[PDB]
Design a protein around this ligand. Structure first.
Ligand SMILES: O=C(NCc1ccoc1)N1CCCC1
Ligand SMILES: O=C(NCc1ccoc1)N1CCCC1
Lengths: 193, 193
């Protein structure tokens, strides 16, 4: 039960490395998972629902990793603390590039994919703004822009720049340089007067 | 000749304020431009080509405005100089939100729209990096990140953040706050040690 479902998910993630969702059929997912077409429809209403679940799992993996960090501060300087946090997203989405690229494309068409992304982006921006606020309250960061507006632009920068790097878009920061590039802009814009 | 073409372009831009390209027909564009369907096909091969031309005009308007600025430096401080430059894009794309949103959606499907965007982004990043390099050569900015990598992330930040603000996405920086938000992050990341 959970086995056939996992099989369908694993097939979809494998097939998405090679072609987009449009070029993958329900019959394709069923065949890869070793089931018939009506059996597929018993676990998922559509191939698009399969992508939704894959993206949901990726998003929650990142969110849980970030929650772990939040409850277990690394013992290091401020620059390293922001790096560890951005690194959650570099590693989690960068470990699932095909789901990330397909999930990105699906935002234009799927209201469920758009709302899932939007919900978690609001959560990650709120967390970012809360940490900035904490840093200002402690006297470590200057009161410049509204924390929440700053947090919004920096998280949108990371969304676009990470996902261009993973897709090898032209232009993009090389994937081996993107973490350092992002950490620099976050630290200078959060702490710079 | 140029009149019927302009009429088709003006109709497409008006209709795109209300619905996406998918919900607009060649018959719709022809009717709005006061021509028949085969007459339309004489000026444009497809509705998608109409969007390509609209986006091409918007992109070149911005590029030309930025080239004007480049040849006519505003007499003001560094923070204001970057603001005037980002403002080219805030004003040009923000004056054409329907074309901007439709052009964005079309990158996923149209190789011509994807290549047009990519060509100009490479040009604007190269210009950004050249100005950063000039500022370092003069001793006004510190040698921190590779100028071109920094320029790439900052232009990708502006792409995503401006276009979220114009579309009223959730999350987004309000359009009345986005210019100041972006200028802050550019100046602190370019000049911050
Ligand atoms: O790197 C990111 N955010 C960094 C972050 C958020 C909270 O703490 C660090 N993102 C947000 C969405 C996709 C990439
Ligand atoms: O604001 C931007 N760039 C700012 C810029 C580029 C060159 O000088 C200022 N962009 C680049 C693409 C869409 C938005």
């Amino acid at each position: 039960g959970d086995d056939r479902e996992l099989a369908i998910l694993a097939t979809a993630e494998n097939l998405l490395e090679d072609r987009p969702l449009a070029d993958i059929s329900v019959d394709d997912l069923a065949k890869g998972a070793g089931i018939s077409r009506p059996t597929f429809y018993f676990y998922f209403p559509s191939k698009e629902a399969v992508l939704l679940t894959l993206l949901d799992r990726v998003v929650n993996q990142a969110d849980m990793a970030l929650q772990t960090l939040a409850e277990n501060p690394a013992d290091t300087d401020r620059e390293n603390m922001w790096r560890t946090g951005i690194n959650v997203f570099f590693e989690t989405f960068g470990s699932h590039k095909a789901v990330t690229r397909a999930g990105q494309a699906a935002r234009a068409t799927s209201v469920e994919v758009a709302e899932l992304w939007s919900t978690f982006m609001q959560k990650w921006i709120a967390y970012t703004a809360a940490v900035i606020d904490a840093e200002r309250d402690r006297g470590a960061a200057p009161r410049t822009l509204p924390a929440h507006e700053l947090a919004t632009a920096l998280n949108l920068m990371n969304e676009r720049t990470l996902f261009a790097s993973f897709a090898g878009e032209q232009p993009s920061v090389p994937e081996a340089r993107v973490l350092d590039t992002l950490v620099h802009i976050w630290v200078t814009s959060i702490y710079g007067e």
